[PDB]
Amino acid sequence: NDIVLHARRGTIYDRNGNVLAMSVDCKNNTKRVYPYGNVGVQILGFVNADNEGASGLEYYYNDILAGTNGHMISNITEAQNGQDIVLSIDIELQKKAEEQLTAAVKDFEAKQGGSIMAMNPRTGEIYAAASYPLPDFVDYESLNLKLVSSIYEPGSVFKVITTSIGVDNNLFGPNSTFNIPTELQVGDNKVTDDDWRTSAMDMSVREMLRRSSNVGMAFLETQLIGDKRFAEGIDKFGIGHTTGIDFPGEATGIVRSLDQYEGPTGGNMAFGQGLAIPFIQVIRAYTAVANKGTMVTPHFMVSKGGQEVSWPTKDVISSSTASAELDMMTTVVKEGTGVRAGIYGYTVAGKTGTGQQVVEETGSYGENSGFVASFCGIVNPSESDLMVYVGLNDTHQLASQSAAVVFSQFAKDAATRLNIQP
């Protein structure tokens, strides 16, 4: 004769206080109700029939969201309901992120979907985030956030890390100019740029970034940085380390340590080849450039039990280096491959990338690996309020015509929705 008094799980609020998930006895059982339907459910996760969090934040914070049931046996013990959680997510921005990512995947023929995220580079709070395919009502693979749990060869979006390391080590600056050949031998393979020249070009570090020269990056790493300082910087930037994001399934990635480097490793990694990491690591690294040199922890939960949590930060580069990098990322958007990411009335510092799909458990790939088109940008970098990432997986269209285009529209909407006026 032991009756269960079912506790209710804690409520999940978005940043404006909208209820995203709440438990109800209309189930005797309890069930979650998601008022905005499928919007943000990928982040929220689902709760199964045993009322256990099964994916997303429901799972990640299940021990605090789940209460403790009561029991009626002449003896009664109280149900303790779970603790409420407030997230950084702006539900209306989440809806746009989802619809824009879905439309982009369709328009640019991204055969393996993509991801999108808007975050505050100073506090680390995530305003919106999504991966395609998205779930509804259910395919278990759509419950992951690809940004966190899938790994890719990052490609050219990584060049901001390589230049930051050099600059922060005082080995060159934006205007430093070098005679860059058409190709360079790295290990036993040649590095080349897809371009017009048939001769070496004198290019400043700023220019190598503007045009995204792989050859220039490999030159910088091999002739100026050196593998040791390179590998130390990668490590300081958190590359190959989990970011600490509060979401399940975070991949650490596959990144060679210095003692495992071989002939071509450093040169290739300089332009984002020879490692495979989740894009959340790239995003996290960019926060250092956007936040005066301090890298933050991307995250969803702002408060639990009315207790605001402190999230770890790390000083990676100086503010001067961060400023020189932002200056160059601004050239990318004003004068280079990122020009379609520009947004009328705002300053956008960013970088395009062409990355690759990889064998998930090894980080390598063959001839038919699909390309990943990415764009990562910071809006009004002096305000420290917004950075957005857009990635399209297995598309044939260049990041300059695809991911950068999606960013201009979504980052604009993120900026209107938030404080950001210009």
Q: Which is nearer to Ca ion, 88 or 156 (CB)?
A: 156
Cβ of residue 42: shortest distance to Ca ion, in angstroms?
A: 28
Q: Which is nearer to Ca ion, 120 or 408 (CB)?
A: 408
Total number of residues that touch Ca ion (CB under 5 A): 4
| R_g over Cα of the chain | 23
Neighbours of 372 (CB within 10 A): 28
Residue 307 carries which DSSP code? E
Residue with tokens 């994001």: 245
Q: Say whether 310 sits in a helix, a strand or coil.
A: coil
Residue with tokens 């001769």: 199
Cβ of residue 354: shortest distance to Ca ion, in angstroms?
A: 5
For residues 104 and 384, the answer to whether their CB atoms sit within 8 Å is no
Q: Which is nearer to Ca ion, 156 or 265 (CB)?
A: 156
**Cα separation of 407 and 357, whole Å?**
21
Q: Which is nearer to Ca ion, 245 or 376 (CB)?
A: 376
Neighbours of 172 (CB within 10 A): 18
Cβ of residue 335: shortest distance to Ca ion, in angstroms?
A: 14
Binders of Ca ion among 309-348, rule CB under 5 A? none
Q: Which is nearer to Ca ion, 148 or 191 (CB)?
A: 191
Cβ of residue 377: shortest distance to Ca ion, in angstroms?
A: 13
Q: Does 352 bind Ca ion (CB under 5 A)?
A: yes
Binders of Ca ion among 240-259, rule CB under 5 A? none
For residues 389 and 337, the answer to whether their CB atoms sit within 8 Å is no
Q: Which is nearer to Ca ion, 44 or 289 (CB)?
A: 289
Q: Which is nearer to Ca ion, 94 or 213 (CB)?
A: 213
**Cα separation of 241 and 305, whole Å?**
29
Cβ of residue 408: shortest distance to Ca ion, in angstroms?
A: 16
**Cα separation of 136 and 147, whole Å?**
19
14-22, 41-49, 314-322, 354-362 -> range binding Ca ion (CB under 5 A): 354-362
Cβ of residue 399: shortest distance to Ca ion, in angstroms?
A: 5
At position 90, the amino acid (one-letter code) is D
**Cα separation of 359 and 201, whole Å?**
36
Of 156, 243, 291, 402, the one binding Ca ion (CB under 5 A) is 156
Q: Which is nearer to Ca ion, 159 or 299 (CB)?
A: 159
Cβ of residue 339: shortest distance to Ca ion, in angstroms?
A: 12
Q: Which is nearer to Ca ion, 27 or 197 (CB)?
A: 197
Cβ of residue 40: shortest distance to Ca ion, in angstroms?
A: 31
At position 204, the amino acid (one-letter code) is S
- List residues in the chain that are followed by a break over 2.5 Å (C to N): 27, 73, 137
Burial of 92 (0-12, 13-18, 19+ CB in 10 A): middle
143-151, 153-161, 186-194, 292-300 -> range binding Ca ion (CB under 5 A): 153-161
Q: Say whether 204 sits in a helix, a strand or coil.
A: strand
Q: Per-residue x/- marks for Ca ion, 191-230, CB under 5 A?
A: ---------------------x------------------
Q: Which is nearer to Ca ion, 282 or 415 (CB)?
A: 282
Report the sign of the C-alpha dihedral through residues 377, 379, 382, 386, in that order: negative
Q: Say whether 315 sits in a helix, a strand or coil.
A: strand
Cβ of residue 33: shortest distance to Ca ion, in angstroms?
A: 44
Burial of 228 (0-12, 13-18, 19+ CB in 10 A): exposed
Cβ of residue 406: shortest distance to Ca ion, in angstroms?
A: 15
Interaction site with Ca ion (CB under 5 A): 156, 212, 352, 354
